[PDB]
Amino acid sequence: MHFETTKDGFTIAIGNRIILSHSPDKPAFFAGFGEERMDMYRGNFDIEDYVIERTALRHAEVSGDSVTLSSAPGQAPRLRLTLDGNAIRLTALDETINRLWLRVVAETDEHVWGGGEQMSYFDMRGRRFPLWTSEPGVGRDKTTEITFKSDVSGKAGGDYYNTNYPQPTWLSSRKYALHVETSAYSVFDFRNGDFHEIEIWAVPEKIEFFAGDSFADIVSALSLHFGRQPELPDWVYNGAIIGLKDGVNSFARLEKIRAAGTKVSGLWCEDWVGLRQTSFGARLFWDWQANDTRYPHLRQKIAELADQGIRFLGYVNPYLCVDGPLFPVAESAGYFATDVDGKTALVDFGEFDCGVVDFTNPAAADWFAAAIIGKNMLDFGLSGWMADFGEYLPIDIKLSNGVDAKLMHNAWPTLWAEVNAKGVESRGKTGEALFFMRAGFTGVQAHCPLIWGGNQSVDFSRHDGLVTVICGALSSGLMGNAYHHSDIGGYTSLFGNVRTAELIMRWTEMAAFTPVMRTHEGNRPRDNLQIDQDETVLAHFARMTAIYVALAPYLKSLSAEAAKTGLPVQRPLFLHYENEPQTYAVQDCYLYGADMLVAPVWKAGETQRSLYLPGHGEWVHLWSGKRHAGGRDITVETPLGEPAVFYRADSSHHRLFEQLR
Amino acid sequence: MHFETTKDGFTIAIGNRIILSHSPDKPAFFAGFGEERMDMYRGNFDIEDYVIERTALRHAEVSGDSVTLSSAPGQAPRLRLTLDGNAIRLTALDETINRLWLRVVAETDEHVWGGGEQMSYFDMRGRRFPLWTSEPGVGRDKTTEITFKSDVSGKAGGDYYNTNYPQPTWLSSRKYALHVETSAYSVFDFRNGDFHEIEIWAVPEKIEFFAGDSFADIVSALSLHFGRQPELPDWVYNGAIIGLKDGVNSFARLEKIRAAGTKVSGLWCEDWVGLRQTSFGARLFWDWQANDTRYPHLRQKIAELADQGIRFLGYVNPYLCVDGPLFPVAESAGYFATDVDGKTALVDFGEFDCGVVDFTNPAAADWFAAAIIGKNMLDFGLSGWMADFGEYLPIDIKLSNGVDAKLMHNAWPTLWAEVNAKGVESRGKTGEALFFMRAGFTGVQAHCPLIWGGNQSVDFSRHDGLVTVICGALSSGLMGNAYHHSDIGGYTSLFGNVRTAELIMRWTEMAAFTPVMRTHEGNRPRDNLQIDQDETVLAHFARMTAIYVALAPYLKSLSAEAAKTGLPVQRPLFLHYENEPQTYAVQDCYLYGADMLVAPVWKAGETQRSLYLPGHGEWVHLWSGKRHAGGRDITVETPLGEPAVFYRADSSHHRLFEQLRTIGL
Numbered sequence A: 001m002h003f004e005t006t007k008d009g010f011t012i013a014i015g016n017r018i019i020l021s022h023s024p025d026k027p028a029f030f031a032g033f034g035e036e037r038m039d040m041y042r043g044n045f046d047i048e049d050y051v052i053e054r055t056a057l058r059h060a061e062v063s064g065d066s067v068t069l070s071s072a073p074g075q076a077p078r079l080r081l082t083l084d085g086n087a088i089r090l091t092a093l094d095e096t097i098n099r100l101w102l103r104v105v106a107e108t109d110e111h112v113w114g115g116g117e118q119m120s121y122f123d124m125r126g127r128r129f130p131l132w133t134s135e136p137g138v139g140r141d142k143t144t145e146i147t148f149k150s151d152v153s154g155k156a157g158g159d160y161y162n163t164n165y166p167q168p169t170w171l172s173s174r175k176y177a178l179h180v181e182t183s184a185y186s187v188f189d190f191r192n193g194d195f196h197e198i199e200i201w202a203v204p205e206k207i208e209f210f211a212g213d214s215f216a217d218i219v220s221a222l223s224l225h226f227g228r229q230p231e232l233p234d235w236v237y238n239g240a241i242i243g244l245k246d247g248v249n250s251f252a253r254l255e256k257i258r259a260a261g262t263k264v265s266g267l268w269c270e271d272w273v274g275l276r277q278t279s280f281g282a283r284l285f286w287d288w289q290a291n292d293t294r295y296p297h298l299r300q301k302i303a304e305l306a307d308q309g310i311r312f313l314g315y316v317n318p319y320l321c322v323d324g325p326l327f328p329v330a331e332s333a334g335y336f337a338t339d340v341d342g343k344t345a346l347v348d349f350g351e352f353d354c355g356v357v358d359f360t361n362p363a364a365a366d367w368f369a370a371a372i373i374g375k376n377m378l379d380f381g382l383s384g385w386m387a388d389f390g391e392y393l394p395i396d397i398k399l400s401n402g403v404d405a406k407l408m409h410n411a412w413p414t415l416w417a418e419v420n421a422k423g424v425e426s427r428g429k430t431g432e433a434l435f436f437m438r439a440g441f442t443g444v445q446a447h448c449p450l451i452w453g454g455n456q457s458v459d460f461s462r463h464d465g466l467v468t469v470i471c472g473a474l475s476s477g478l479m480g481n482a483y484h485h486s487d488i489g490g491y492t493s494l495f496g497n498v499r500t501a502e503l504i505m506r507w508t509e510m511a512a513f514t515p516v517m518r519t520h521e522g523n524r525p526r527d528n529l530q531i532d533q534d535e536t537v538l539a540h541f542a543r544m545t546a547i548y549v550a551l552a553p554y555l556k557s558l559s560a561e562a563a564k565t566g567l568p569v570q571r572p573l574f575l576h577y578e579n580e581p582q583t584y585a586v587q588d589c590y591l592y593g594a595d596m597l598v599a600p601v602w603k604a605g606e607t608q609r610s611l612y613l614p615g616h617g618e619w620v621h622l623w624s625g626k627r628h629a630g631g632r633d634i635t636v637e638t639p640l641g642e643p644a645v646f647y648r649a650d651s652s653h654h655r656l657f658e659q660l661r
Numbered sequence B: 001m002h003f004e005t006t007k008d009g010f011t012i013a014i015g016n017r018i019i020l021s022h023s024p025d026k027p028a029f030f031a032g033f034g035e036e037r038m039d040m041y042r043g044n045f046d047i048e049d050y051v052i053e054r055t056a057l058r059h060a061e062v063s064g065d066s067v068t069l070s071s072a073p074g075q076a077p078r079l080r081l082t083l084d085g086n087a088i089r090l091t092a093l094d095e096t097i098n099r100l101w102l103r104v105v106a107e108t109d110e111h112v113w114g115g116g117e118q119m120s121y122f123d124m125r126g127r128r129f130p131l132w133t134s135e136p137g138v139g140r141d142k143t144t145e146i147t148f149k150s151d152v153s154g155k156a157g158g159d160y161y162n163t164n165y166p167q168p169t170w171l172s173s174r175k176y177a178l179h180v181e182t183s184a185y186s187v188f189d190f191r192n193g194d195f196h197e198i199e200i201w202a203v204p205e206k207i208e209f210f211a212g213d214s215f216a217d218i219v220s221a222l223s224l225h226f227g228r229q230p231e232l233p234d235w236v237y238n239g240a241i242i243g244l245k246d247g248v249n250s251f252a253r254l255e256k257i258r259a260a261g262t263k264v265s266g267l268w269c270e271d272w273v274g275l276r277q278t279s280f281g282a283r284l285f286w287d288w289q290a291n292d293t294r295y296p297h298l299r300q301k302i303a304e305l306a307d308q309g310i311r312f313l314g315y316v317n318p319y320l321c322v323d324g325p326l327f328p329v330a331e332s333a334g335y336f337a338t339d340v341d342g343k344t345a346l347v348d349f350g351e352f353d354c355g356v357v358d359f360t361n362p363a364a365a366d367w368f369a370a371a372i373i374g375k376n377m378l379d380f381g382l383s384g385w386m387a388d389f390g391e392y393l394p395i396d397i398k399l400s401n402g403v404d405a406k407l408m409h410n411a412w413p414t415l416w417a418e419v420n421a422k423g424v425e426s427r428g429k430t431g432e433a434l435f436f437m438r439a440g441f442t443g444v445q446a447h448c449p450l451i452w453g454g455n456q457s458v459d460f461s462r463h464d465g466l467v468t469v470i471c472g473a474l475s476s477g478l479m480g481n482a483y484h485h486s487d488i489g490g491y492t493s494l495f496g497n498v499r500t501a502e503l504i505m506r507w508t509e510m511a512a513f514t515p516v517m518r519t520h521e522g523n524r525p526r527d528n529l530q531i532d533q534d535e536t537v538l539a540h541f542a543r544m545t546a547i548y549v550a551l552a553p554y555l556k557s558l559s560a561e562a563a564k565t566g567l568p569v570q571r572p573l574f575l576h577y578e579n580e581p582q583t584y585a586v587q588d589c590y591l592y593g594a595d596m597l598v599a600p601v602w603k604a605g606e607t608q609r610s611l612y613l614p615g616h617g618e619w620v621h622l623w624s625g626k627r628h629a630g631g632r633d634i635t636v637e638t639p640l641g642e643p644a645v646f647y648r649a650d651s652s653h654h655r656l657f658e659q660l661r662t663i664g665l
């Protein structure tokens, strides 16, 4: 990075690219003080700042590699910048600053991607994105009835920026990435043509920069910095993970699914710990051991399924319910986050109370890894699980390490990911055991082998349906999470919103061209269509699993590529077509590796799909063999069973693709 | 008021009452800079500030009655304070400031009222109130389906703080009032226990203070400062103003209403200019002269009704539609507000586009007063009218006086009020012509003789129904508007929300204990029940008009009191019961003068009403004659016809009140 003087002040650049521009009249930094409200209701945050001071740091004193910044000439310095390689280090000289604003130079036509896993907008330009892990919202669009009803009944509607996995990292179309090293609340403000504004409710230790001649190279460098995932385990390629939460009846339903020719890698029973009925629906009993009442011979059933080549997966989250036998064990060992009066802090998760296992206490972290992940899950015979939640830390609780909950809230998913990874490592099962997370922050990449898109509504809505999965895959992919998947058919059934046959089949069509096909009965299983309950849906499902298994050699090559280069399995078109401006904001299509293009149908009643075909080569339609020229919009027939999928005519895997026809 | 120095800085007090407290660690003033967005859609504003600087003025140099304020010691001074009498004068020393924050000292249990005409919250403590005249919203509550559908279809839902009539004036339970002399956007922030914060998108010329031993005396002093209204004209006391927009059929409907025994002071036909029927509702043709197609005999019908003791009222607003014959007259004379390129600025009202008559051009203001108010209305025989709108000035339009639309937006209702008042004065009809306004700002009090509560939903909802009228009366009353009323049965019918018989009758019951009973067919007349269309509603309406006419001598005494002392007809209980803390936040009951207490039923299906009865005396239930002791909660039967109304047993008007029981029976 190059410091350079100008007429009125200075610039900081990486290569040809000016990043920071300071002058008294156009300052780069503003500093001040706020009093926030962050009220939590069931993982939804009502956040409002009261800004008491915001003051431009107009005056810069340069002393070599250090810049000292003050409000005005003669006034006491408030902030120090140090250029240290690819990083701007920041030191608060005024202890009272808890609000910092930083402007980075922007061009009018610049795109910015990342922000963690964004569900609504892939290109974030033109909008503001707070970065605070939470419930992402049901509906997530104030103009829909579902969002309105979620807001009225539970403050649960959310909005376009809410995510289980925020990250204060962006990739710019100017070919640099920026990372802020903080766990504090922060906002990316992309509303202004001439600058991006970062708000941080802290002075971060540093801001780190990555540059390169291609987007691919910057993503490689980001994945190396956050850490890469192991290759997918070989057993995943055997077919779909069937999600059932029907107790002993799960096994009879698995048999019916297999009898239709379905390729099955795994049975995933999140109710392995038993059910809890609430007004939300069929929830789980949060006590992390096999429930002999619900699954009386589970250890034997796991060994029986293993002899048929089918793994078994469960469910765990980092909270313990008050009415479970593990709660008093953990409370006696002092493993819970505490309230102001030193008592176990109880959080309302929705008509039941749970303690938060305090992962800042190393003994609590070690216990959860060894006793629950190790003994109760891996030694019991689980090959994997949903590793759920991580986003419910309220800011009014006290943690063993003495760090404010305001700073630990965003750190929680990364701590939770590490507990899972340590338990896996302790059994030598890294790269074989498959846990998947919906929550995240900086560093989850190093610990979690597979992200899932959390809870979608059971619909085709713009802001909470099928299409939001693709946005989540593309964003989280640029942040160095190579492997993304979703619940086939979505999760959230509320206010009479229920699945259709068409929704399940369209969702299956996308999932077959992702790393993992997994189903989910959802929050209200008996109110919603399941893959086994309609002959047409089941036959469609079986066929798509056969297509997934036939594509295994191609997916295995993409997983190898992800381990060697960091590039995600689901790629935005601009990553391989930099000179084509039409590819830069596309968020409902992805490149499945370099060689396939996928354009999922995300609306009810569509028989056709229009998409931009990139490049100067030919693309082959997977189902017909018909060739199409790159560099134009095209329309193809997409009846049920035949998603808009194309491969490069020059693909080394052409013989494999020709077979899936 | 006096400066007093302390260890670290200074205080400003009126008597025993600290108002401003400054120290470097706890400053009173913050200054900076913002870039606002204020996008208008049919009078609804989407407002968002981008605050670029907010900087505490930590350093004060005190020099007699004057203080100079800077960010820090040694830095260039930014603001000057001078105490001149009851006022703090402010001078910007830095030309770049367009944002000023001022903290005034508060106690944890302090109440604050005013803010103009507030429709949701009378006691504003605990919440923030932006002060920008607009459409007040349909539903005005983000948890209702009406608000949701209004937001989705037209960004039209609004919220608790939206009002046709904001005013940067408050009365404190600490017995002072504060007035900010500005027309800029401002916010009253009452969210903090220890201070009130005022935000202003300008440096105001001054902040004025009023202090007294009683709330009544502070209201008197505020009314003297803004200006008082004439007494109600004698003809109002003859009964209800019947609102009809049914053309020639209006007269046959008036006859059926009169045949039921209804006491009628006036026929109000807003469609006197013609009905613009759309798929969306029954709007008016915005060209301000009698329409010979709609009312072919209007001049003769006015003289016929006058011989029967019935006045005629119309409708006017300060905009002209492009397809009307007055538009070209005004365009040719240069009487319209202009866009950036100097062309006539057209504003979208929904189904039609209109020009804004530029009242900052004196010739345009004089033309409107002489040609429209004078010739087309008063000389045509109108005794009064709805003087509508005033809140739709967009901030991207250019005005003849060269003042930014950002400062003229809030001033518009007061300029519009003045045009109406000048036209009335030009015919010597001040105190006789009755025009009524929904929009307002500082000074509307001096010009407008009667406020109306604007458009309510046709419902009992908390944030847009019958109960919001009472909140509007109490707030606007403390601001020196002595006379308030509402459309009987509300206005806004959208999304299948339609009137019930019960809604009309409950609304009528309240209106009979207000200065003016007036009906309105609303935006969708044929979808909604009207007072003449149900035998039970009509009979109930006739009886309440007889009650109103019998109460005239009492209302006349309250109007005399309003002209002499400034006190509003509809008073908050705390104004006459200062030592009773239960009276301070009550906003669904009012004192109708000192001697009557009114507790309207504002919910469907209620047969009973509970209220706090104040004082150490006895109250008489109007309908039964049964006495009730002051100083406790009471529950009375409130069947249709018998609102919870009480009078003081010791009232000099007891003989009049005793008589209402028998009209009643």
Ligand SMILES: O=S(=O)(O)C[C@H]1O[C@H](OC[C@H](O)CO)[C@H](O)[C@@H](O)[C@@H]1O
Pocket (backbone or CB within 6 Å): A135, A270, A282, A283, A284, A285, A388, A438, A454, A455, A491, A522
């Ligand atoms: O019902 S439980 O809580 O026991 C289990 C579920 O927990 C998460 O969803 C819960 C919602 O976030 C509630 O607001 C997962 O996303 C889902 O797959 C899983 O079934």
Ligand SMILES: O=S(=O)(O)C[C@H]1O[C@H](OC[C@H](O)CO)[C@H](O)[C@@H](O)[C@@H]1O
Pocket (backbone or CB within 6 Å): B135, B270, B282, B283, B284, B285, B388, B438, B454, B455, B491, B520, B522
């Ligand atoms: O239909 S018109 O617009 O020509 C006349 C009406 O104008 C106002 O209401 C209009 C709303 O504010 C629209 O948003 C008055 O309040 C109402 O009484 C009157 O009937």
